[PDB]
Amino acid sequence: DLRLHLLLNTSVTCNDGSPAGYYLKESRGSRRWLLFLEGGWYCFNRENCDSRYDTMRRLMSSRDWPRTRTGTGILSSQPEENPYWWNANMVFIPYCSSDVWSGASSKSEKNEYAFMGALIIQEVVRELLGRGLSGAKVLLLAGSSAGGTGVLLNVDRVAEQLEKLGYPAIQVRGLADSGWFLDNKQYRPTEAIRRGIRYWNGVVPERCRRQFQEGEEWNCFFGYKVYPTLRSPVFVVQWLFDEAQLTVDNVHLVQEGLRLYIQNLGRELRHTLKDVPASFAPACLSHEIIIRSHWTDVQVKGTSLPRALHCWDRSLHTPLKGCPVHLVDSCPWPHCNPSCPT
Numbered sequence: 375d376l377r378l379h380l381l382l383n384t385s386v387t388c389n390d391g392s393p394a395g396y397y398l399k400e401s402r403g404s405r406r407w408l409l410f411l412e413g414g415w416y417c418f419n420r421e422n423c424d425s426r427y428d429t430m431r432r433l434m435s436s437r438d439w440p441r442t443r444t445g446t447g448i449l450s451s452q453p454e455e456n457p458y459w460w461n462a463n464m465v466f467i468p469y470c471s472s473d474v475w476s477g478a479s480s481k482s483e484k485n486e487y488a489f490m491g492a493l494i495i496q497e498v499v500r501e502l503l504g505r506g507l508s509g510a511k512v513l514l515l516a517g518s519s520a521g522g523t524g525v526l527l528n529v530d531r532v533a534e535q536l537e538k539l540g541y542p543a544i545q546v547r548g549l550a551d552s553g554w555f556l557d558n559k560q561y562r563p564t565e566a567i568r569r570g571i572r573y574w575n576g577v578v579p580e581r582c583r584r585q586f587q588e589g590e591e592w593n594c595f596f597g598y599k600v601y602p603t604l605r606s607p608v609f610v611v612q613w614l615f616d617e618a619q620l621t622v623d624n625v626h627l628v629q630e631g632l633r634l635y636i637q638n639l640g641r642e643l644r645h646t647l648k649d650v651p652a653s654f655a656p657a658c659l660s661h662e663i664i665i666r667s668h669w670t671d672v673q674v675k676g677t678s679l680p681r682a683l684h685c686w687d688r689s690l691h692t693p694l695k696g697c698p699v700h701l702v703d704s705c706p707w708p709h710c711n712p713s714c715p716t
């Protein structure tokens with residue numbers, strides 16, 4: 375079990391002004407630290423956020439959070455469930471800012487809600503330094519869905535934070551699961567993120583901001599546009615037929631028009647990953663993986679995801695014999711990979 379700690383700086387808050395926080399399980403024999411960002415879509419205006427507060431309140435408030443959480447998948451401490459990093463220090467950071475981890479705005483006389491996702495990450499890092507993170511060798515910032523996009527938006531800021539505070543020996547890396555989307559034509563979203571960024575006072579990485587310039591920062595929420603600008607090592611996990619991608623594309627599972635649409639989506643996703651040297655992209659219809667207990671089961675070209683992440687670690691000590699890091703399926707239809715989840 376990971377134990378809850380509410381942030382000591384109570385001005386860093388969830389949407390409703392309650393304190394943000396993190397769940398922690400220390401492993402004092404280890405100098406590896408895994409900080410996982412939870413997902414769960416977002417909200418982009420007052421009416422839309424009001425509805426989320428009514429029926430998704432744990433994603434907006436800490437008032438009802440439980441004292442403990444069980445670590446699963448990559449957050450498990452059991453070698454059989456987590457062959458990759460079972461002995462690491464484990465941190466789960468709840469998503470209670472509804473801003474894809476981008477916001478830097480407090481609740482005030484003019485703001486019903488606080489959107490502080492980018493500041494929550496930095497405050498968690500600061501408070502962990504006094505609980506052992508100061509001695510770390512590797513900080514892996516991981517996340518799923520909106521949290522996977524949050525990794526891409528925040529990994530270089532964490533690296534700069536630690537350099538500026540005087541911890542040059544901590545190697546910061548990212549793991550982005552199910553947060554790599556296409557701004558494509560629907561079969562039958564960009565306006566929501568354009569509105570949301572203004573509502574949240576959302577912030578994106580500096581090099582990406584300088585490329586796209588004022589008014590166009592929404593571009594940096596799409597993985598294939600923000601990833602080339604990043605300096606920290608980032609491993610990308612993305613199903614080729616992601617269920618959230620197909621939902622916003624208005625695809626519900628076939629005649630020729632839809633067959634061609636689905637095949638083109640997989641081809642485009644595979645193209646965006648061609649120059650991503652650390653990646654895992656199976657030809658499956660699914661969504662999220664790294665904190666699911668059976669994340670050990672899927673394989674690409676005979677290599678599992680925990681193995682690919684271990685090979686990535688070795689590469690950061692040129693290609694390794696029998697230990698690949700770039701694993702993208704070539705077959706063109708969901709479940710042409712026999713190891714896909716059922």
Ligand SMILES: O=C(NCCc1ccc(O)cc1)c1ccccn1
Nearest residue numbers: 474520523555563567595618619622
């Ligand atoms: O919301 C979507 N796009 C707006 C930007 C965005 C927001 C959040 C995020 O995590 C990544 C990008 C979207 C587009 C395609 C498939 C699914 N969702």
